[PDB]
Amino acid sequence: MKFLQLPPRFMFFTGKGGVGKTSIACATSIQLANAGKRVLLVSTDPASNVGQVFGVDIGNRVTPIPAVPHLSALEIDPEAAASAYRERLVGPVRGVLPDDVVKGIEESLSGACTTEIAAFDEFTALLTNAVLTADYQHIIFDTAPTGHTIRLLQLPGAWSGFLEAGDASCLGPLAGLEKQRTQYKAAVEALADPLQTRLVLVARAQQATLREVARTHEELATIGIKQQHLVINGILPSAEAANDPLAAAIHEREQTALKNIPATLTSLPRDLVQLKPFNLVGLDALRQLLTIELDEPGMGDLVDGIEADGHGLVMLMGKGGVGKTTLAAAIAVELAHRGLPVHLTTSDPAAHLTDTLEASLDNLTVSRIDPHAETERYRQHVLETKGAQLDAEGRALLEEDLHSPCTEEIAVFQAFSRIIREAGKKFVVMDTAPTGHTLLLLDATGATHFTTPMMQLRDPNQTKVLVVTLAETTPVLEAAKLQADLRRAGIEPWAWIINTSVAAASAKSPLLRQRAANELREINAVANHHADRYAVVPLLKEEPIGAERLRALIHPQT
Numbered sequence: 001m002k003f004l005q006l007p008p009r010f011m012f013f014t015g016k017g018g019v020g021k022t023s024i025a026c027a028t029s030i031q032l033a034n035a036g037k038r039v040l041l042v043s044t045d046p047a048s049n050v051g052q053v054f055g056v057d058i059g060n061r062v063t064p065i066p067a068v069p070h071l072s073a074l075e076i077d078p079e080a081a082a083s084a085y086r087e088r089l090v091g092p093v094r095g096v097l098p099d100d101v102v103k104g105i106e107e108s109l110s111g112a113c114t115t116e117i118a119a120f121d122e123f124t125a126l127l128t129n130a131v132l133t134a135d136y137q138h139i140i141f142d143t144a145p146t147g148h149t150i151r152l153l154q155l156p157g158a159w160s161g162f163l164e165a166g167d168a169s170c171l172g173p174l175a176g177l178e179k180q181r182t183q184y185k186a187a188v189e190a191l192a193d194p195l196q197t198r199l200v201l202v203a204r205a206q207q208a209t210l211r212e213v214a215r216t217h218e219e220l221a222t223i224g225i226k227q228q229h230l231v232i233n234g235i236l237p238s239a240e241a242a243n244d245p246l247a248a249a250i251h252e253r254e255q256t257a258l259k260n261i262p263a264t265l266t267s268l269p270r271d272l273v274q275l276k277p278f279n280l281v282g283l284d285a286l287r288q289l290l291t292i293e294l295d296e297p298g299m300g301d302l303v304d305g306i307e308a309d310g311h312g313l314v315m316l317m318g319k320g321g322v323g324k325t326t327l328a329a330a331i332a333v334e335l336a337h338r339g340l341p342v343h344l345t346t347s348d349p350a351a352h353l354t355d356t357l358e359a360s361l362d363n364l365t366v367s368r369i370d371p372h373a374e375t376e377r378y379r380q381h382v383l384e385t386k387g388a389q390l391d392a393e394g395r396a397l398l399e400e401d402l403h404s405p406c407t408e409e410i411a412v413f414q415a416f417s418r419i420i421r422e423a424g425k426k427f428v429v430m431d432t433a434p435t436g437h438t439l440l441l442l443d444a445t446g447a448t449h450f451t452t453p454m455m456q457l458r459d460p461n462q463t464k465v466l467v468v469t470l471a472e473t474t475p476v477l478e479a480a481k482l483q484a485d486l487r488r489a490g491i492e493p494w495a496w497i498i499n500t501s502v503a504a505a506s507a508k509s510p511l512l513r514q515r516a517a518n519e520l521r522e523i524n525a526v527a528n529h530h531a532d533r534y535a536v537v538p539l540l541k542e543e544p545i546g547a548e549r550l551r552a553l554i555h556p557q558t
C-alpha cells in the first residue's frame with residue numbers, strides 16, 4: 001500500500017460519503033499500531049460505528065483500545081460543536097433582539113457549512129496542541145476539511161463581525177470561532193506541509209466519484225497541499241464476474257472507470273482496495289482490509305402517485321452521485337409516455353441522456369442548465385452588486401465565501417426558478433433541489449435572477465421533494481440529514497428513492513449477495529423510520545442512456 005509508506009504525523013482522508021474513508025482509516029490505524037508506532041484514530045462523526053468496531057465506548061476523550069496495543073481512539077462530534085456554537089452565540093441575543101433577527105442568526109449559523117467549519121475547528125485543536133503531537137506518532141484522521149473551509153480560515157482576517165450583519169451568505173459561522181486566528185493559520189500551515197500531512201483521497205471506481213475526487217484534489221492542490229495519494233476503494237474482484245451477468249457488468253464498468261481516470265489524478269500514487277467478501281464489522285475484518293428475492297415497491301407506484309396528483313413539481317434531492325439525474329430523466333420520460341406534459345430540466349451537461357427523445361415526443365421539453373456557468377454568473381453578479389464598497393480584505397473574503405457549495409446551490413436554484421415560471425400547468429421534473437439551509441437563507445433575505453417563493457415549495461399539493469439514497473449506511477444517514485434539514489425548512493419530502501439497489505437486481509454471486517443482504521437491511525431501515533413512501537430502483541447492468549433503457553428503471557421486468 002503506497003499511501004502507508006513513510007507516513008507523516010497526520011494522515012487525513014477525504015472523498016464522497018460512503019466510499020470507505022472510515023474503514024480505510026481504521027485499517028490503517030490497526031496496521032500502524034501493529035508496526036509498534038502509537039496512533040490516534042480521530043473519527044470525525046458521532047454516528048460512526050468505530051466504538052462498536054473496536055468494542056470500546058469512544059467519546060470526546062482519548063480512549064485507549066485494549067484490543068489493539070498502542071492504539072488510541074478519539075471521536076470528534078462536529079454536530080455537537082455546531083450546537084455549542086448556536087448555544088453560545090444565540091442565547092446572548094435571545095429575547096434581546098426581535099425574533100426575526102434571532103431566527104436569521106440561527107439559520108445563518110446552521111447547516112452543512114457550520115458543521116464543516118466546526119469540524120475544521122476540532123481538527124485545528126488536534127493539529128496544534130503540543131500534547132497530542134508529542135505523544136502519538138500518527139494522528140490518523142478520518143475526514144479532511146473541504147478546500148473551501150481551509151481557504152476561508154486561511155484568509156488575512158476581519159471575520160469577527162459577520163453575525164448580525166443573511167444576504168444568502170454562509171460566511172457567518174466564522175464569528176462563532178472563539179480561538180486565535182494564529183491557531184487556525186498554524187493548523188493550515190501544518191496541514192499543507194508534505195512532511196506533516198498526507199491527505200489521502202478515497203474514491204470508488206466510478207466515473208462520477210472519480211470526477212468529484214479529481215475536483216477535490218484540484219482544490220486541495222490550489223490550497224498548497226503538494227503530495228497526495230489516491231485510494232480507489234471498491235474494486236470488484238475479477239474472479240467474481242466469472243459466471244454472473246450483473247457482476248460482469250459491474251466489473252466492466254469499474255475497469256472502464258479505471259482506464260479513464262481524470263488526467264489530473266493520473267500522477268498520484270494509486271492504490272486498489274478490493275471489495276473484501278466478509279462484512280467489515282469488528283476488528284477481525286478490518287485487520288485484513290489492506291491486503292434472496294427482494295419484494296419492495298418500484299418507481300411505478302411513485303410515478304402513479306405523481307400522475308394522480310398532476311400539475312406539480314417533482315424535485316429530486318440528495319447527495320451527489322446517488323443518481324438524481326438519471327432518476328429525474330426516467331420519471332420525466334415515463335410521465336411523457338403517459339401523455340401528460342413534462343419539462344425535464346437536468347443539471348448534468350456531460351450526460352446526453354434523454355437527448356435522443358426530446359424532439360421525438362412533442363411534450364417532453366428539456367432544459368439543460370449548466371451549474372458551473374450559473375455559479376459563475378451569480379458570483380459575478382454578487383461581486384459587482386455587493387462588496388464593491390468593501391475594502392480589499394472584505395472583497396477577498398466575500399469571493400472566498402462565494403465558492404461554497406451553498407452558493408452553487410443558490411445559483412442553480414435561481415436558474416431553475418425561471419424554468420418553473422416559464423413552464424406553467426405542466427409537470428416540472430428537476431435534478432437537484434436546494435438544501436433546507438439554502439431555502440431558509442433565501443427566504444430570510446427577502447429584501448433579474450429570482451428564487452421561487454418558499455410558500456409554493458412548502459405546499460405538498462404543488463411540490464414533491466423526492467430524496468434519492470444510494471442504499472448504504474452512510475449515504476442513508478446523510479440523506480436522512482438532508483431530509484431533516486428540509487423538514488426544518490418546512491418542506492416534507494414526498495417519498496424516497498433507494499437507487500442502485502443490488503438487492504433488487506437479483507444478485508447471483510457471493511460478493512453481490514452479501515452486498516444485497518446489506519442493502520436489504522438498509523432498505524428495511526429506510527422504510528421503517530425515514531420515509532413513509534419509498535421505491536427501490538434495481539441496479540442496471542447497462543448504463544442508463546436514452547429512453548429505451550431509461551424506461552427500464554420505471555418498469556423493471558420482475
Ligand SMILES: Nc1ncnc2c1ncn2[C@@H]1O[C@H](COP(=O)(O)OP(=O)(O)O)[C@@H](O)[C@H]1O
Binds near residue numbers: 275
Ligand atoms: N474495501 C471494502 N470492502 C468491503 N466493504 C467495504 C470496503 N470499504 C468500505 N466498505 C463498507 O462500506 C461501509 C461504509 O463505509 P464507511 O467507511 O463507513 O464510509 P464513510 O467513510 O462515509 O464512513 C462499511 O460498513 C463497510 O462495510
Ligand SMILES: Nc1ncnc2c1ncn2[C@@H]1O[C@H](COP(=O)(O)OP(=O)(O)O)[C@@H](O)[C@H]1O
Binds near residue numbers: 351538543
Ligand atoms: N439505477 C441505476 N442503475 C445503474 N446505474 C445508475 C443508476 N442510476 C444512476 N446510475 C449511474 O450513476 C451515474 C451518476 O448518476 P447521476 O444521476 O449523474 O448523479 P447526479 O445525481 O450527481 O447527477 C450515472 O453515470 C449512471 O450511469
Ligand SMILES: [Mg+2]
Binds near residue numbers: 021022
Ligand atoms: Mg465516516
Ligand SMILES: [Mg+2]
Binds near residue numbers: 431
Ligand atoms: Mg446530477
